[PDB]
Amino acid sequence: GIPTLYTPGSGQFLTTDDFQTPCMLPKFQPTPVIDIPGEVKNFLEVVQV
Amino acid sequence: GIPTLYTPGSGQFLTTDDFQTPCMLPKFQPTPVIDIPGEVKNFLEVVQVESLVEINNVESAEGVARYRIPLNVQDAMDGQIMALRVDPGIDGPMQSTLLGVFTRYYAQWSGSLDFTFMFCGTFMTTGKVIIAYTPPGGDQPTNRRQAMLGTHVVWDFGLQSSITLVVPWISSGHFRGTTLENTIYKYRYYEAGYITMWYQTNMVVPPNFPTTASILMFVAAQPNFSLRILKDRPDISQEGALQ
Amino acid sequence: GIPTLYTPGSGQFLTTDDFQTPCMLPKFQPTPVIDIPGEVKNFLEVVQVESLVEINNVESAEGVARYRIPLNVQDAMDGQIMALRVDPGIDGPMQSTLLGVFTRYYAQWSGSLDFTFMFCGTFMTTGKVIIAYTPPGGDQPTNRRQAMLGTHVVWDFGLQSSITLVVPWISSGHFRGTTLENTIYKYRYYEAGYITMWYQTNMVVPPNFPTTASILMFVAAQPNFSLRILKDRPDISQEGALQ
Amino acid sequence: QVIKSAVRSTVENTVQSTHSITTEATPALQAAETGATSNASDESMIETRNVVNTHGVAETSLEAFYGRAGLVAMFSTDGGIYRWYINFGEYVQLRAKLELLTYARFDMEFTIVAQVVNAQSKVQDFNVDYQVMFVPPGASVPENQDSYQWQSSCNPSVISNTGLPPARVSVPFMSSANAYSFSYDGYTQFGDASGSSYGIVPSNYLGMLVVRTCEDLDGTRLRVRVYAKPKHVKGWIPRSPRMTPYKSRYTGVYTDTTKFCANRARITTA
Amino acid sequence: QVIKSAVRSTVENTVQSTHSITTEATPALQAAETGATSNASDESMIETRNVVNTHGVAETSLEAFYGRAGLVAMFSTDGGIYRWYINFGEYVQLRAKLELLTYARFDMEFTIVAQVVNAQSKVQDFNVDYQVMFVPPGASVPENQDSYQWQSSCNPSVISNTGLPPARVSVPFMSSANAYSFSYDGYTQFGDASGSSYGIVPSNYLGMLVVRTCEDLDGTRLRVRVYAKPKHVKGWIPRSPRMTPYKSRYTGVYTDTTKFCANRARITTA
Amino acid sequence: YTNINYYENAASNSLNKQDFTQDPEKFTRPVVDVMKEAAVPLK
Amino acid sequence: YTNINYYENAASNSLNKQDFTQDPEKFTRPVVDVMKEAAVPLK
Amino acid sequence: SDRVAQLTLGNSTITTQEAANIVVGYGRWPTSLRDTDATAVDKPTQPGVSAERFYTLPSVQWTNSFKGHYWKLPDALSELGLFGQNLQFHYLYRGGWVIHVQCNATKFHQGTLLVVATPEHKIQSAESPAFARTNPGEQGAAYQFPFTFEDGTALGNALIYPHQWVNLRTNNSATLVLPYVNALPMDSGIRHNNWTLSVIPIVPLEYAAGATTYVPITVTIAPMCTEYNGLRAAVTQ
Amino acid sequence: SDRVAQLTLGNSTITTQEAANIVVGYGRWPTSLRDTDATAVDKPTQPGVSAERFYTLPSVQWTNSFKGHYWKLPDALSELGLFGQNLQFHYLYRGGWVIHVQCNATKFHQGTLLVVATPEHKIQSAESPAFARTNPGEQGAAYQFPFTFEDGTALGNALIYPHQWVNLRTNNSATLVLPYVNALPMDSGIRHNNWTLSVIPIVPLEYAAGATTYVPITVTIAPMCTEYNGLRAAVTQ
């Protein structure tokens, strides 16, 4: 066993956290990304209208 | 799973710990750092500035007057003007100074101190005073003769209004405790010594002039001063959450 | 999150563990390491120093006198002077020595021992004594004849006041237990042997001289001595927190 | 500008000096009127020896002085909820420290410690789930334990348990300003000459924390303590330290005094 | 200086010797009066064989002897708080070990084990939050469970729970001296010829630990044990080991005795 | 020794480890005319 | 094997792993005049 | 550290024959807003010599009961010359200062004044400060609690801020050059006072019997390196 | 290991014709304070030959009831010659020693003395030690508990400290050179005694009937490589 020391924060659920988590369907393969007009990347594109 | 073994300490909240923790706003972008005069990087920059010593801490002295050392035309010789312990972190005249507030935020100190005195009598008022630093061993000196056997400076009044008395770092150990609390820790072990002022000659004035004048007392840390072990300043307290 | 699997041992506090732990004062800077004479790196340096053996542990002997081996002019030959077990960690004459205090802090030992004897009679008092080390097997020898069949040294009194008797490491195993506690562990298995002293000739004195003189007994570990497995010294105890 | 600031990691050494009988060099003579601090050095006032001084200066850096958790809030729920306004004037210790600088920029580490207590304020060994939601100004504040606002789809929330280690998150430098101000000689809004709007930097107020218990406790309540630790500290313009007691949580109002240190019998007795 | 100290990792080998009949070499003859320990070796007193000895010397190093936790304090709260003065004279085992060196420098690992007990001192299965605050000399010491000093904005504090693994922190070499002293033939202050101020190194006292329970326990109390482990040990001038019982926590006072080992009937009987 | 960042934003980083001091001149001697130690201040 | 430091201050480090002994001469034979084993001590 | 000086700004020139060097706060002279700090996008106005000159305020008498007097900046000049006009007409203002405090007596008098400029000096000795004390105008206001600096701190530690002393035996004036300080690139000149200039007596005015007893203290201030943004109609707090 | 010696320091020369080599504590001769260990910033005083010479103390009689005698250093010389003067006038002191213990009898006598110098030898056999025992002066003090070394340890293990023996059949003197030892670069010579010098009889004085029975023990000590800091007026504990 590798010596570890867990710290404050452990177990907490922060809604803005960003960890990698096991996928429920590890081998799943999504449909293709097709060509669709009007893609938006940032909402600043929208408030400029 | 990677084999791990958690150890004692796990889950504890040490207020001085230093871990990396997830940010609540991962993608947040702070405003720019603009140009602002007077940046400080270390508090040692601040204790090196001279601030006034509340040396006249007597019943009769209130407010601004507690900063004034009193001089007056003598009719006797070799007399004493003032006395004080040089210890920067103990209760007394030095606790409300910059050097003191910060020395009181720490448990140990080391370094030479800068004691600067400025005369405020009239341009025609003259005088010579001797200021001495007596190293540890006994009690404050009892007369000028005993005082001048230590580290001193003879000050002559003139155009250059002030004079500096460096109380050099002379200690058995590299550091001293900031308090001399004795009943428990027996910290009187650390007492740094005394600083006394005496008339070298006399304060002489022309006819009809004020026969008493004032000396202001400045104090700062020298460039070889440093503090160790942060602790809570004893003068800041409360009885309950503020309304 | 990185997949982990905690194991048995987790959370335990083993007093001999060796992990890195957060410091309470992360940025603290200790005073300098100055030059101080007499540094020690290993306690083996200390058990190699000769210290006095409390060899005269009898009712009639109190205090300083328990360090004195008694000699006296004989009127019979080949007589016995003293006897003792060489085991350094068991109760008896050797437990208050440096070698003993430290052997008693450990559970196993190995090595040759240095037994040095110094004569303290008058310059005119002469004599020859035989000191022997009898290896394990039976009981201490009963007469000089049986003793001299083992490892011995014949000592002649003179200007060189002392003599050394090396009790060499002769053991079946590489190490021995420091105690011979028998009722449980049956550790009498480890007994190292005996050391006896006998008159080789006689102690002869001129007219009117003291007819008894003293021998002091020194003991230390040789350079091939080592200890293993630390344990609490049995002689240090208390009944409750000290006032 | 004109005066440069060199950087160092150890205090200054002492070098050997000798006697001096001269009329050209008078280092002991100063003039405090100039606004300058004396510059007479050890070597010039006495005969000194050589001393290679290696005493460090680390524990007095802004980061070493400020870099540790301190209490900023303590409270109990009333109906399974509590709303606290994020401001550090409730508890004086950390407050008196921050007010040693005029302007400063820093990130923060918030640690939250919670536990359940009964009506007589006696701690209970009860593990319950709790939620801490940061509600910025302009966002709808929850009226009670189960209002819709706790869905928290945009507002940051942290959900932990009184049986889990304390919760902890880092917070960036969030002001609209370029530094937080700990002294402000001005008003909060235009057209207001009222004392109630003096000395408050509104941009130092970034919202409130609303705490609740995910499910109702039967007869007990959540007791919460919020600690805050400054990180990556940057500060400008050191200030004269606080020498009188705090009275109000939101202002520096104080009671005048005639002395700071206690008196002694004679100025000539140490 | 004059005598050099070589370094080694194994005890000395034994090399084969032979007989000797001579008047030039007398290794067995010594003179204890000189202050020197005999230097007669195995090979010179008897005929020996070759022995490649690889027995190590590691477990007798300062670090192997001192490097393990030992009890230094044990106590219970009275009103949800307790103040202990950091000094190792309460428990004799670790004390007797440290006093084997005159001066020494070392870091320390403190492990704190806590649990709740009722009035009859019977352990309870109760998980409660506790706080341990280090208060250096000159800092205001808490009078009780909820005084303002527990805000701990500068003083180091550790907050853990009786249900979490024991708490543990490392501590640097903190004395104002260049080493801790375990024997001091002097006084604590100038102008004091009193026996009560003799033999105490004040710089060995760095404060106190104040323990409390974050919230009040109803009828029970916190039972605490503090363990301390020396690390990175450096020592000078080994001392004559303690041979009589300790009586006082703060001084080496003792009761004289006339023997150390028990007596036996005859000096000639092993 | 190891100082590597795990999180995205710099606010998550541990305390700065550059604890030095700088010349206090901007605070102790903010004057225009140089007043050398060996000289008299007012001339 | 692995010996790498995680924490900032050296007080956090694990125990020293250099456990050797040195010549005890400064303690066992702190004399000015050399007294060889083969010789008589007092001459 | 010469004892004489001449200060010439715009169409105004000031002189003193008994000075004690010149202080530059934080070692920084006044500078204009850089393009990387700026946020207000409109081209600024820069009055030049019309607003960057010396303005003398009405004198204060060093009486026997005198505790000190203070002026807030830019409040004190908020209504003087074109500097004040520009302050009112613009939402935003930025600028530095050159301060010259004057007080001559004779070689038969003794007294000592602390002349300090404090960044963000709050007048908080009252629960609800009166606008007449936080913003006293060109006449400034008198000190009521000089020992606690009107803000709960020690007067003695006010030397941590840019300052000089007027010690009658040594000098008859104090001169300070102050840079702009704020946690913002610019701010409103009517809603926020960046600096406060105080003259507090620490050693009382005394003199040989019969000497002149009427001793005034005159303060003369000059905006320096100023710039304004957000032009509109005139507005005061 | 010669049996004769001459020790010359300053204006004093000592000789012995029956020595037993010379011990140097911890193998280190006295050395001055290095610049990297020093902390007191003032230039030190170094008396030289005025204080670094041999001082002989009053003799002690080896009586029948004799348990031993001890002297504390620098206490024992705290009032002798210029060494003592320098000790009193300075706050700080640092220094080494050269010790020569003397005791001659005849070839018709027998007895053995342990001559040991112990660093930080506490006299703690009493709950509140009397100043007259912790600091006995030049006359020193007598042993009351020699077996427990007055500090709760075994007399027999005192050989872990620098020592020699005076075994009447072998030598009439013991010689020790001690370096400065402390957890400090310097310390006060009046508040702390670094070394203690004890002469304890382990084998009682005996002799052929009629031999001289009056046998003294004389101790002669010399400060060596000393330095002082923190000059002021004279002060004693």
Ligand SMILES: CCCCCCCCCCCCC/C=C\[C@H](O)[C@H](N)CO
């Ligand atoms: C979800 C976890 C809770 C995170 C809370 C984040 C709150 C944002 C922190 C703002 C810190 C700014 C504090 C600055 C100044 C103080 O309030 C002053 N004392 C007010 O004058």
Ligand SMILES: CCCCCCCCCCCCC/C=C\[C@H](O)[C@H](N)CO
């Ligand atoms: C927040 C966790 C608690 C950490 C406590 C830190 C305390 C500092 C440790 C000081 C250790 C020095 C001990 C040295 C000597 C002993 O006290 C001696 N027996 C006293 O003579």
Ligand SMILES: CCCCCCCCOS(=O)(=O)[O-]
């Ligand atoms: C009460 C249960 C506490 C055990 C949780 C500890 C998980 C171990 O953490 S680990 O070292 O990162 O793998």
Ligand SMILES: N[C@@H](CCC(=O)O)C(=O)O
């Ligand atoms: N928004 C939910 C309640 C939120 C909660 O309890 O988590 C509702 O209105 O039903």
Ligand SMILES: N[C@@H](CCC(=O)O)C(=O)O
């Ligand atoms: N300082 C707080 C109490 C501290 C605590 O209970 O954590 C107060 O006076 O309200």
Ligand SMILES: [K+]
């Ligand atoms: K340096």
Ligand SMILES: [K+]
């Ligand atoms: K000068």
Ligand SMILES: [K+]
């Ligand atoms: K200075």
Ligand SMILES: [K+]
């Ligand atoms: K070997």
Ligand SMILES: [K+]
């Ligand atoms: K030999």
Ligand SMILES: [K+]
């Ligand atoms: K040996």
